[PDB]
Short mmCIF file of N, CA and C in Angstrom, two decimals:
data_model
loop_
_atom_site.label_atom_id
_atom_site.label_comp_id
_atom_site.label_asym_id
_atom_site.label_seq_id
_atom_site.Cartn_x
_atom_site.Cartn_y
_atom_site.Cartn_z
N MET A 1 -9.89 -14.55 -10.05
CA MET A 1 -9.34 -15.19 -9.25
C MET A 1 -11.01 -15.36 -8.37
N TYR A 2 -10.68 -16.52 -8.32
CA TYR A 2 -12.14 -17.50 -7.31
C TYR A 2 -12.02 -17.18 -5.90
N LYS A 3 -12.92 -17.37 -5.07
CA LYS A 3 -12.57 -17.33 -3.87
C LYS A 3 -12.02 -18.54 -2.75
N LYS A 4 -12.21 -19.07 -3.82
CA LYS A 4 -11.71 -20.39 -2.97
C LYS A 4 -10.18 -20.86 -3.44
N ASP A 5 -9.86 -19.83 -4.05
CA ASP A 5 -8.48 -20.02 -4.29
C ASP A 5 -7.55 -18.84 -3.11
N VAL A 6 -8.23 -18.01 -3.58
CA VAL A 6 -8.04 -16.59 -1.94
C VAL A 6 -7.99 -18.22 -0.42
N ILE A 7 -9.17 -17.89 -0.27
CA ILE A 7 -9.48 -18.46 1.27
C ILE A 7 -7.85 -19.25 1.69
N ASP A 8 -7.91 -20.09 0.29
CA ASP A 8 -7.19 -22.13 0.02
C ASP A 8 -5.60 -21.59 0.96
N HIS A 9 -5.22 -19.88 0.37
CA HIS A 9 -3.96 -19.17 0.48
C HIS A 9 -3.77 -18.55 1.71
N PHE A 10 -4.83 -18.26 1.88
CA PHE A 10 -5.15 -17.76 3.73
C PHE A 10 -5.42 -18.57 4.31
N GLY A 11 -5.98 -19.14 4.89
CA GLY A 11 -6.33 -20.46 5.10
C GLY A 11 -7.75 -20.19 6.28
N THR A 12 -7.77 -18.29 6.48
CA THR A 12 -8.53 -18.06 7.12
C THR A 12 -9.02 -17.05 6.27
N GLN A 13 -10.37 -16.49 5.86
CA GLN A 13 -11.26 -15.48 5.96
C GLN A 13 -10.08 -14.48 6.68
N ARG A 14 -10.38 -14.01 7.74
CA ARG A 14 -9.77 -13.19 8.78
C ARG A 14 -8.83 -12.77 8.50
N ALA A 15 -8.18 -13.49 7.91
CA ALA A 15 -7.14 -13.62 7.28
C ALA A 15 -6.97 -12.54 6.17
N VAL A 16 -7.36 -12.68 4.98
CA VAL A 16 -7.88 -12.36 3.91
C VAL A 16 -8.20 -10.52 4.10
N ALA A 17 -8.65 -10.24 5.11
CA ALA A 17 -9.78 -9.04 5.57
C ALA A 17 -8.76 -8.39 5.75
N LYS A 18 -7.54 -9.20 6.66
CA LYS A 18 -6.50 -8.12 7.43
C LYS A 18 -5.32 -7.79 6.02
N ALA A 19 -5.51 -8.55 5.39
CA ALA A 19 -4.62 -8.29 4.11
C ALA A 19 -4.80 -7.05 3.48
N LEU A 20 -5.96 -6.93 3.00
CA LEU A 20 -6.79 -5.61 2.17
C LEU A 20 -6.80 -5.03 3.56
N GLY A 21 -7.55 -5.34 4.18
CA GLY A 21 -7.82 -4.15 5.77
C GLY A 21 -9.11 -4.32 5.31
N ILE A 22 -9.02 -4.63 5.32
CA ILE A 22 -11.27 -4.65 5.61
C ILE A 22 -11.74 -6.36 6.35
N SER A 23 -13.16 -6.32 6.69
CA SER A 23 -13.62 -7.19 7.83
C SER A 23 -14.42 -8.27 7.20
N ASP A 24 -14.44 -9.24 8.24
CA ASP A 24 -14.18 -10.73 8.04
C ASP A 24 -15.40 -11.02 7.22
N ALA A 25 -16.63 -10.11 7.17
CA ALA A 25 -18.46 -9.92 6.92
C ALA A 25 -17.89 -10.68 4.96
N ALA A 26 -16.98 -9.46 5.08
CA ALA A 26 -16.70 -8.48 4.08
C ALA A 26 -16.20 -9.88 2.44
N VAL A 27 -15.20 -10.59 3.52
CA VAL A 27 -14.75 -11.87 2.64
C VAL A 27 -15.29 -12.70 2.15
N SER A 28 -16.53 -13.39 3.19
CA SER A 28 -17.57 -13.99 3.23
C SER A 28 -18.83 -13.51 2.39
N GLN A 29 -18.86 -12.31 2.25
CA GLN A 29 -19.68 -11.93 1.53
C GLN A 29 -19.73 -11.98 0.05
N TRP A 30 -17.84 -12.25 -0.21
CA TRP A 30 -17.53 -12.23 -1.77
C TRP A 30 -18.44 -13.25 -3.22
N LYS A 31 -18.56 -13.56 -3.78
CA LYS A 31 -18.92 -14.44 -4.45
C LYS A 31 -17.93 -15.11 -5.62
N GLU A 32 -18.08 -16.00 -6.44
CA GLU A 32 -17.32 -17.35 -7.26
C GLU A 32 -16.17 -15.87 -7.93
N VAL A 33 -16.37 -14.89 -8.21
CA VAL A 33 -15.14 -13.94 -7.90
C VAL A 33 -15.13 -12.93 -7.51
N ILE A 34 -13.98 -12.79 -6.62
CA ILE A 34 -13.77 -11.54 -5.96
C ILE A 34 -13.77 -10.64 -6.37
N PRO A 35 -14.47 -9.50 -5.49
CA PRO A 35 -14.15 -7.87 -5.69
C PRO A 35 -12.71 -7.44 -6.75
N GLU A 36 -13.45 -6.35 -7.99
CA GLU A 36 -12.63 -6.05 -8.48
C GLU A 36 -10.75 -5.21 -7.81
N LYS A 37 -11.20 -4.52 -6.67
CA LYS A 37 -10.29 -3.77 -5.78
C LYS A 37 -9.79 -5.23 -4.96
N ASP A 38 -10.81 -6.08 -4.24
CA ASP A 38 -10.27 -6.82 -3.66
C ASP A 38 -8.55 -7.56 -4.42
N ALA A 39 -9.77 -8.11 -5.42
CA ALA A 39 -8.21 -9.08 -5.91
C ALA A 39 -6.86 -8.18 -6.75
N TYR A 40 -7.62 -6.82 -6.78
CA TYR A 40 -6.07 -6.29 -7.20
C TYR A 40 -5.14 -6.34 -5.60
N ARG A 41 -5.10 -5.59 -4.53
CA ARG A 41 -4.40 -5.71 -3.42
C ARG A 41 -4.35 -6.94 -3.22
N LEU A 42 -5.24 -7.58 -3.51
CA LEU A 42 -4.78 -9.48 -2.81
C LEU A 42 -3.33 -9.76 -3.73
N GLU A 43 -3.17 -8.93 -4.66
CA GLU A 43 -1.89 -9.79 -5.89
C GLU A 43 -0.87 -9.20 -5.06
N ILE A 44 -0.89 -8.14 -3.73
CA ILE A 44 0.23 -7.64 -3.42
C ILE A 44 0.38 -8.59 -1.92
N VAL A 45 -0.93 -8.88 -0.97
CA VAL A 45 -0.23 -8.97 -0.32
C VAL A 45 0.20 -10.77 -0.05
N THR A 46 -0.71 -11.62 -1.66
CA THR A 46 0.24 -12.89 -1.52
C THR A 46 1.22 -12.50 -1.94
N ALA A 47 2.28 -11.42 -2.18
CA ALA A 47 3.94 -11.36 -2.52
C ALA A 47 3.41 -11.59 -4.50
N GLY A 48 2.52 -11.34 -4.55
CA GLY A 48 2.09 -12.05 -6.29
C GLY A 48 2.13 -13.16 -6.16
N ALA A 49 1.14 -13.84 -5.05
CA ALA A 49 0.37 -15.23 -6.02
C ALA A 49 -0.26 -15.06 -7.10
N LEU A 50 -1.06 -14.67 -6.91
CA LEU A 50 -2.71 -14.85 -8.05
C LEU A 50 -2.17 -13.56 -8.94
N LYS A 51 -2.42 -14.28 -9.95
CA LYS A 51 -2.25 -12.84 -10.96
C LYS A 51 -3.10 -12.57 -11.17
N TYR A 52 -3.16 -11.26 -11.33
CA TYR A 52 -4.25 -10.06 -11.66
C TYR A 52 -5.27 -10.36 -13.16
N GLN A 53 -6.19 -10.47 -14.00
CA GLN A 53 -7.04 -10.04 -14.96
C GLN A 53 -7.55 -9.67 -15.20
N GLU A 54 -7.89 -8.51 -16.31
CA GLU A 54 -9.22 -8.04 -16.78
C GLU A 54 -9.96 -9.20 -17.80
N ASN A 55 -10.43 -10.60 -16.87
CA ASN A 55 -11.14 -11.20 -17.34
C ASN A 55 -12.81 -11.85 -16.98
N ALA A 56 -12.59 -11.32 -15.94
CA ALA A 56 -13.95 -11.99 -15.37
C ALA A 56 -14.34 -10.12 -14.66
N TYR A 57 -13.09 -8.65 -14.00
CA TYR A 57 -13.29 -7.99 -13.94
C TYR A 57 -13.78 -6.98 -15.45
N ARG A 58 -14.16 -7.44 -16.54
CA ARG A 58 -14.62 -6.58 -17.76
C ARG A 58 -16.20 -6.51 -18.13
N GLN A 59 -16.58 -5.48 -18.23
CA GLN A 59 -18.31 -5.23 -18.13
C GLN A 59 -18.55 -3.94 -18.52
N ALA A 60 -17.86 -3.88 -19.92
CA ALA A 60 -18.38 -2.55 -20.37
C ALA A 60 -18.94 -2.89 -21.50
N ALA A 61 -20.04 -3.27 -22.22
CA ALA A 61 -19.85 -3.64 -23.80
C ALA A 61 -20.99 -3.64 -23.94
#
């Protein structure tokens, strides 16, 4: 899940933070790929808009 997509679905960062329950700072602090715990709840608030995948959230090899 790319932050560029999330912000496009929410429109305003403050919105995303309100969906998950975090501050606006946390949203902007995000990188090319939103946190593993943020991308999760994000799939719920967006009504299952973005399908969560364990591709970029898999680092244990």
